[PDB]
Amino acid sequence: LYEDPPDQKTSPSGKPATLKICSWNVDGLRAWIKKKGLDWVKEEAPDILCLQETKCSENKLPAELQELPGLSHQYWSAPSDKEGYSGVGLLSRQCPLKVSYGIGDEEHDQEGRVIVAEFDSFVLVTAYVPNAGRGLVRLEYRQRWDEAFRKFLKGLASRKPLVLCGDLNVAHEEIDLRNPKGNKKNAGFTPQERQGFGELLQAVPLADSFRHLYPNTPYAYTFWTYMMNARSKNVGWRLDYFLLSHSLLPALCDSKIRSKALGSDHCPITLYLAL
Ligand SMILES: [Pt+2]
Ligand SMILES: [Sm+3]
Ligand SMILES: [Sm+3]
Ligand SMILES: [Sm+3]
Ligand SMILES: [Sm+3]
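Above are the sequence and the samarium (III) ion SMILES. Below is the predicted complex in structure-token form.
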């Protein structure tokens, strides 16, 4: 059902890509390292690697992350009460001008979900958005989060072009999941979450890089449940995105979905920019 097209590495004005960003929900940093996730990254050779759901719990990170001379500047954020839940990471070849954490909203900053890395010509934000939960028990909160996240990004974007990436926990449109009819009342595809995504795009403003480039391509997913071998039947959801300021659209070369990369229930996504 899906084969990501070849990497286009020149922007529309012919400028070659100078920045390769990779984002990946690793479903557990160590479990992922064990599944050989780091080798795939070594092959991808991105300049910036953004990781979501690291689930780290101790006073030390895996030694394997010290073997990356190409992604030597590493930033991490895990829950205040760090216990195998959530957690994000941002590893960069070059040193950002500034790395901050959270969105400046206490009640939304206790779960190690956001890292902001400011660069010369843009600000990068990696996020692991709160899942609405089984039985939608956390849907009211998620709407409060969406609202606060949106407003934070709108403010960052007002000072410098923005690139948001990560596992945003929402398949925006019907084309973003294999079973839209059966999930309208499940976390990730509720009207509230879909509205929230559409509202993020409108308010910042932000453009969905992959959909902007492949507006009619179906079956492009970044997550398949481990249950019932959904990855092999390509029964999935597109939950990971690279959202960008409109001002960055002429620098956009390509937004990829590395469907073949194993190591998690999410596959990595990659962005090429000519800055
Ligand atoms: Pt199934
Ligand atoms: Sm998970
Ligand atoms: Sm508040
Ligand atoms: Sm529609
Ligand atoms: Sm340049």
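The chain has five helices and 14 strands.
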